[PDB]
Amino acid sequence: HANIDESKIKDTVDDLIQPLMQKNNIPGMSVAVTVNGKNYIYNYGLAAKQPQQPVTENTLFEVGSLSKTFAATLASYAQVSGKLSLDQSVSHYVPELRGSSFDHVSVLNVGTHTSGLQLFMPEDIKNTTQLMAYLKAWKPADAAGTHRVYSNIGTGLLGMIAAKSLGVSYEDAIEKTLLPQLGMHHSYLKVPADQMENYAWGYNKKDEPVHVNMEILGNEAYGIKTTSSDLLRYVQANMGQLKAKMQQALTATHTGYFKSGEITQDLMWEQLPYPVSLPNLLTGNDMAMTKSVATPIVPPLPPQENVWINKTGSTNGFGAYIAFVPAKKMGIVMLANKNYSIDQRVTVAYKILSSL
């Protein structure tokens, strides 16, 4: 249609996403954009190849490490409810780690990837007893609070501590409290039977259909399955656009606690100044697997409007990205059932938001 922006936006998104899916052999995608208070959802391709099933408004994707921001939101909710202090040590909340290295690791450290815990849970840890034995014996290579090492284990502790401070399991905290209060009714840690037909298959490097296997503390770090529509609601809630403790909690996760390279590290969210240069955005999204120096921001930077806030997420079979700019009330969710390179996710999102 002439003189309407939904047709302009669809043209921009189609022109970027269709060649992206072709050249990377991505079976299906959903892209959700919010601007000017309006929501636009674009679906492409196949949720499953055999039997064939299209991506629909109801399609659930694994979001991988986007899940970390829900653990942060829960910790922030516990903090605004008076149940959790981020500067206290991890062993203050987990008494079985009293006398270990976690006497000198704060909850803020695990919420900002500055504890020094490694990226991946050791593969032979499968129950709580083995987990506690590992954590009691662990020692970081540098003092907690000096370096940033992106960590699934640290995120797991953040979520576990937040849930315990609220008196519930993490799964209960997310599925019975957090997601319902956000109005995200088609977001799950465990997909129910009536939604299994909507659960897209992921396609791995060998193009085999795969679903993520949930291991210990996995819900906190990589467990969320959701629709692009529910995640767009999450983005809008993070920008204060929807109809008080929960809004306070969402906003407070945007507090800036450490500088590392080009990014400001918030509570799991990461941010860059806006307007953002694409080179710095690409550099800031290439920090997933290496150690970097981390410098505290004290007093912490309050949640800002004039910033680009983002998070990548991946599993073996899926690739996701969220970015939003509160000053412009604009945001994007990109979900795919193949794990394609982060530089391509970020570049497409930059091009789409810059077109608005």
The CATH classification of domain 1-356, taken from the options 2.60.120.10, 3.40.50.1000, 3.40.710.10, 3.40.1280.10: 3.40.710.10
Query: Active site residue: 30, 65, 101, 151, which one?
Result: 65
Binding-site residues from annotation for AMP: 65, 150, 215, 314
- Is 65 catalytic? The answer is yes
CB neighbourhood size of 36 (10 A): 9
DSSP bridge partners of 203: 209, 338
Query: Active site residue: 44, 77, 93, 150, which one?
Result: 150
Binding-site residues from annotation: 65, 150, 215, 314
Instruction: State the method.
Output: X-ray
Resolution to 1 decimal place, in Å:
1.6
- Is 187 catalytic? The answer is no
